């Protein structure tokens, strides 16, 4: 075992230290004034690596004994099925830990303070609910689809000089997949070969493989075959495969594993295009697209198999050969595909398309967003301060401490702008109090202005996940009983 | 230089340390201000686990060299006879060891001390189950059906602001469950909006699942099918799996199919045309209880229908719950098994109700079996303390010495309840003892008040087994530690 | 390593330390309220072993350089010709050494002090002089066989609620074990089925194995064959012998198995070697080699061998045996922690009872022998010559501690007990002794506690006689390499 | 430590120290009250062993670095022709070394002193005449067959209480051994191993003494009677010889005095009270009178019947001078290159 045993105030402190270290590095990364960062490390890194996105660097390395790594791990789940935009979820969570020093003065027990979280719901819910922020997102929508939040996600990243346009393309992908929950079957690739727009949109799925030097280049009214088992007396295997194949009219074969050489000669003459070691992730997503099939042994063809017969072909779009799957009857799942100029910046586009894709799917379906530039946060602060006075006995302590926390956010945005935040903090406060949700910190202005004109909106999901996760972590470690061994691993 | 052997006083200490280590962690769990805790481990442990229940976490891990794992193992037999109540059995065992420091100055004989346990054989029979306390817990009971023990188990959870009313309902469910076939038949769900009352009772089982958009709205004279295995010549075989399902199905009159896992697409089309309602990926916890409810079935392969399946036949439908529509299973022949649905007042988790469901009836099965109870909130505890003082005096010489020390132990329990409250502990002890001394069994510790109050009004009462089984548990593993005094030799320095 | 060099004062001290260390552990063990203990070691030891019987743990372990193991080794000789009842032999010998401190003060000739050992024969008289005990034990004894001393060995042990019946069974084992066949061939095991009797007695040797489902039910005028080499020609000369049963210690070849069934011969697969070695003594033996082994080279006793269902499982019984030296008992029981401990008691019971029959004498237990013994010896130190007397009087006060230990483990006050105890014994009642349940003094005979006369004789012969050599020795015991 | 190489004053000491170390264990062996002594060893040794006879235990093992094992080896050849009585050859040989402390102060040729051994031949002849020898014997002999010297050999042994009886038994064995043949089976009681075979070698000594008693035709009074008489006469002898002869004469004579002292002490009576009375009776002319240990004084040895074989006394006298003589003449036992 390891047996590192935590005692009262020396338990709370480890959580406290982890939060402060993360906040300074992540703070400069936010929005339009976001910045790239580089890292050099001990062990096997041997050099300085630069990642604009905070989440990618945190998972790669677990530097020291206090455990902040687990808090870090959670952000990815957010990133794959929602996620990023700007990194603020970690920052807000960290700031709530500072107040705990104040809490020892209270000196009862942390759990009584925990009442703040029920009220975190009441104070915050009013805050998200202070309204405007979201235009409404009617459904698909002609121009509100983008030139908003995806563009800002890109803003912290340099590729935005010509990649603002790439971001615009991504919303089209989310609109066609709306309904039945969210994200499944979305993938993106980039091709070396320049164009001003830097992109091509495929109505189907993009795969990078070829059967061999021989085989028909284009297939029509294609049938798709997926096998759980590889192709690998021998002639009898050859004979079974040919007999079943001709009747179906099979135009393409996709198998997720190693493929045997004998069938390959047959596929070329037959007029059937096969793919060696096709990636499973593409196949499962593809299956929703083609209606799928139950993949068994060679008995698999015809009815137990369901293929989509619109158009499959391998297309030279520039340099590297790719295969285009097109014509999804289901309509539920689609891809996108990207082009470039042949630059380091282009590979960065790959980095941010994922960033763009996740935000919009959630933005459209949740039917909510918040005003950026701290508009939502200052307004939230004004509403919460009166709330503490309103609440009774056990209610009126937890909520009050939470309320002053919101004050710091306006201050952080003003400084990164460069203007004096002291003037800024209450000049800002007066505008939110007045009733303009659209008003907030304008970094470009240097004072306060209209956020809505700017076009910065934050996904409603990015804001709820951050606030709930912020202190749940704080309360769990202090409580910890009979800790066992050590190290997250 | 190795051996790992130790001298008289030191040997006693290794056992002594184990009791103190466990007591502080279990300490936070007790009473209304109880806390949830997390653990991390290496070596066939996946991730952090948090267990509200003290017994579950102790069973899973053999943490270190000191002896205490066997002490821990015993609590499970207790969590069979009755259950968790509120964890406290482990705490009492630990305090037994503190006096031992005093015992060095006892100046007589440690083996002689062992005779106290012999005394305890007839002492766990005296103070325990032979004192005053309440007049309650025989079958049914109208006024004291609840407004009792559910509230104390519930006390550890802060939701008790409205939750205590929720706990009131729980015994009505227990009364119907009494009979043959111990326990597993109860399910509960929470809702996102509602009234001051905060909860409703439904005649049948509550579920939030649907086969698909298509299928008949309602079924009568319903037959229920439960399958362990999912629905998920070979090309023809799919047609045949489809054929076996319909052939067996039509003769029975199959009204509803419930499967605990993923369901194959081919059957779905069949069920819609047939007029059969099925549930995809229904969770296991609802299923085991439902089986007890219907009359059971043997869940095997597709042969599962007809005789091997027993199905109740009143009404299965999706219906009326205030804001959310759920599928109601009702009119079951057993009647032993029934459901308290509840609805949510609206606080963050409110998933609390699912945990409280389990809490409500397991304790109660023993309630009919014991025909007896005690008053919770430490009411019994101060009363026993005042009463046990007399008991030590009753037994002469050797017999009294083990018994009086035990009596002062009861004093701490009132204090621990006070401690989680946030009120000053010293004040609490004075006020508490006088009320009990007077002769009023109902009076107890009111934590919100900070003083003593009527326990019955809040509720909190304890089942008779929870109070007789626990002391025996306290005396577990502790006895193996010091009844035998032999650890061997010394080889200088 | 050579011979360890110690002289005068220092040499004596090493002997002195060994006796005190052993006495404290053995002390809690004695009597009805004795204690079970657990020991942990390293190297060739697995985990924890618990033995109520003091002799078993001492034989197993020779932990360190100081002298004591040869003394310990001797107790086994004591067991063969009695040894047990309850452990007490080690305790009395140890207290002998405390007096040696007073010896330096005498400052003359420690060897003349040895003459006190001459007085040891008087001790053999006097220690047991203290009033009459028993006198019959004719041989076999239909009623006087048990229901006294065996129970006492068991009383310390937890199992006594039903065990006392099992102990009773053990005398039967001793009766067949009398004479000089050596102390060998006694086999005991426990079984899962439950009954009030809690045990069974078999006239022969028990083995738990079967050839296979096919084969005859029983054999008569049986011939027994044991082979060293595995089965992995047989029928033609097997028929000649008339072979009724074959026992092999290892894996058995399948082909002969079909043949044995038709012939009418029952064979045993993977028979344990330990059972086999004893069996050879039993049947006159044979010489085991290759398949040439049958006929005259093989000797087989011919009573009858059969397989009998005990009640819960199938067992095979070997009985008769012309030679007669070796016999077996098969035990079974109610199924308790207490049943497992039945193993503890039979080993103890066989030896206690075996000497009960040929000892001719027993003593009153519960400290009765010890208090009275103290009273008689005190008068004599004054009567005997000076220095030998000095050793003799000190020895007398040693007996005092035993009364104190028995009362103390019962939870009653040791001080009060000593005063009242001595007056009873002093008066002249042989029967009166310490009643732990009572907390005072009472009649030992009603309890039924008695001790074998020789258990008492070799606790003191080792303390005495041999102790002539203790001061004499100078350099003691170790190992026995490889 | 740091490489040992001892010379003159401390080199002499190593021979000296070996003799004193051996003497303490063996001294208790002599006289009617003696110590049985048992030894247990490591490496192919199984149990504690008991051997009263000093000579064999020394033969069995070579315990330490100082020289003495070769001296020890020699005592066995003594055993072959006579052997025991009591083990006095090793202690008396060692006895001569204590006096050497006096010699350093003498500071005049230690070597001249050594020549005394040559003159010990004169001392050996002195011992004859002095010895106090009886008549009797009469071949076979109904009552004087034993309860004598064997008893003396065994007096020392603790087991004298029971054993003096079986010492008596051994002369019966010697009576059957007489007649045309020179030098049946007897069973003893003991511990267990090879060391038990020590008894065969150790009791070799008892058989021979008795055998000599039947064909010696001569024996001497036991219980120390022989020793005091010889002592009174030898004092005269130094005075009776020329000064070169006399120095090795007179020193040898006082050695005899210690034997009376050891005999009386083990009895249980004051050691020196006995010395006064003992000398007076021998001086008078009664060869029969000697040390009566149970009495604590002096008495008639003949009534006791205790007698020592003429051969035991004859050979010891010759053997003591020859064994002691070689040690002074020879170096320190080492040198000659390659270690």
Swiss-Prot record, chain C:
Gene3D superfamilies: GroEL, GroEL-like equatorial domain, TCP-1-like chaperonin intermediate domain. One of its GO terms (cellular component) is cell body. It is found in: Cytoplasm. Its EC number is 3.6.1.-. GO terms for molecular function: ATP binding; ATP hydrolysis activity; ATP-dependent protein folding chaperone; ubiquitin protein ligase binding; unfolded protein binding. Keywords: Acetylation, ATP-binding, Chaperone, Cytoplasm, Hydrolase, Isopeptide bond, Magnesium, Metal-binding, Nucleotide-binding, Phosphoprotein, Ubl conjugation. Disulfide bonds: none annotated. It catalyses: ATP + H2O = ADP + phosphate + H(+). InterPro entries: Chap_CCT_beta, Chaperone_TCP-1, Chaperonin_TCP-1_CS, Cpn60/GroEL/TCP-1, GroEL-like_apical_dom_sf, GROEL-like_equatorial_sf, TCP-1-like_intermed_sf, TCP-1_chaperonin. It holds the Pfam family Cpn60_TCP1. ATP binds at residues 31, 85-87, 451, 456. The modification Phosphoserine is found at residue 47. GO terms for biological process: binding of sperm to zona pellucida; chaperone mediated protein folding independent of cofactor; chaperone-mediated protein complex assembly; positive regulation of telomerase RNA localization to Cajal body; positive regulation of telomere maintenance via telomerase; protein folding; protein stabilization; scaRNA localization to Cajal body. Component of the chaperonin-containing T-complex (TRiC), a molecular chaperone complex that assists the folding of actin, tubulin and other proteins upon ATP hydrolysis. The TRiC complex mediates the folding of WRAP53/TCAB1, thereby regulating telomere maintenance. As part of the TRiC complex may play a role in the assembly of BBSome, a complex involved in ciliogenesis regulating transports vesicles to the cilia. This is T-complex protein 1 subunit beta.
């Amino acid at each position: 075992a390891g047996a590192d045993e935590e005692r009262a105030e020396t338990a709370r402190l480890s959580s406290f230290i982890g939060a402060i270290a993360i906040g300074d590095l992540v703070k400069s990364t936010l929005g339009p004034k976001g910045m790239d960062k580089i890292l050099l490390s001990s062990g096997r890194d041997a050099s300085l690596m630069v990642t604009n996105d905070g989440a990618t660097i945190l998972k790669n390395i677990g530097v020291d004994n206090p455990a902040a790594k687990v808090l870090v791990d959670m952000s990815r789940v957010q990133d794959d099925e929602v996620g990023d935009g700007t990194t603020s979820v970690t920052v807000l969570a960290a700031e709530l830990l500072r107040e705990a020093e104040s809490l020892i003065a209270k000196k009862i027990h942390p759990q009584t303070i925990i009442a703040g979280w029920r009220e975190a719901t009441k104070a915050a819910r009013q805050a998200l609910l202070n309204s405007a922020v979201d235009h409404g997102s009617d459904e698909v929508k002609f121009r509100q689809d983008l030139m908003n939040i995806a563009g800002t996600t890109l803003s912290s990243k340099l590729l935005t000089h010509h990649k603002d346009h790439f971001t615009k393309l991504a919303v089209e992908a989310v609109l066609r997949l709306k309904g039945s929950g969210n994200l499944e079957a979305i993938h993106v690739i980039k091709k070396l070969g320049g164009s001003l727009a830097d992109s091509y949109l495929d109505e189907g799925f993009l795969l990078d493989k070829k059967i061999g030097v021989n085989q028909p280049k284009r297939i029509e009214n294609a049938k798709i075959l997926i096998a759980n088992t590889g192709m690998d007396a021998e002639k009898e295997k050859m004979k079974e495969k040919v007999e079943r194949i001709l009747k179906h009219g099979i135009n393409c074969f996709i198998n997720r594993q190693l493929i045997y050489n004998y069938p390959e000669q047959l596929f070329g003459a037959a007029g059937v295009m096969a793919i060696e070691h096709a990636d499973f992730v593409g196949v499962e997503r593809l299956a929703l697209v083609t209606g799928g099939e139950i993949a068994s042994t060679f008995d698999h063809p015809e009815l137990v198999k369901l293929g989509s017969c619109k158009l499959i072909e391998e297309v030279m779009i520039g340099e590297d050969k790719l295969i285009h799957f097109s014509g999804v009857a289901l309509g539920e799942a689609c891809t996108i595909v990207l082009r470039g100029a042949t630059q380091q910046i282009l590979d960065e586009a790959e980095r941010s398309l994922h960033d763009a894709l996740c935000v919009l799917a959630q933005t459209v379906k949740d039917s909510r967003t918040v005003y950026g530039g701290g508009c939502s946060e200052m307004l939230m602060a004004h509403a919460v301060t009166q709330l503490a006075s309103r609440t009774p006995g056990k209610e009126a302590v937890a909520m009050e401490s939470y309320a002053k926390a919101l004050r710091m956010l306006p201050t952080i945005i003003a400084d990164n702008a460069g203007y004096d935040s002291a003037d800024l903090v209450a000049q800002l406060r007066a505008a939110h109090s007045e009733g303009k949700t659209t008003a907030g910190l304008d970094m470009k202005e240097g004072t306060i202005g209209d956020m809505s004109v700017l076009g910065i909106t934050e996904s409603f999901q990015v804001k709820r996940q951050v606030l709930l996760s912020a202190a749940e972590a704080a309360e769990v470690i202090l409580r910890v009983d009979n800790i066992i061994k050590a190290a997250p691993r």
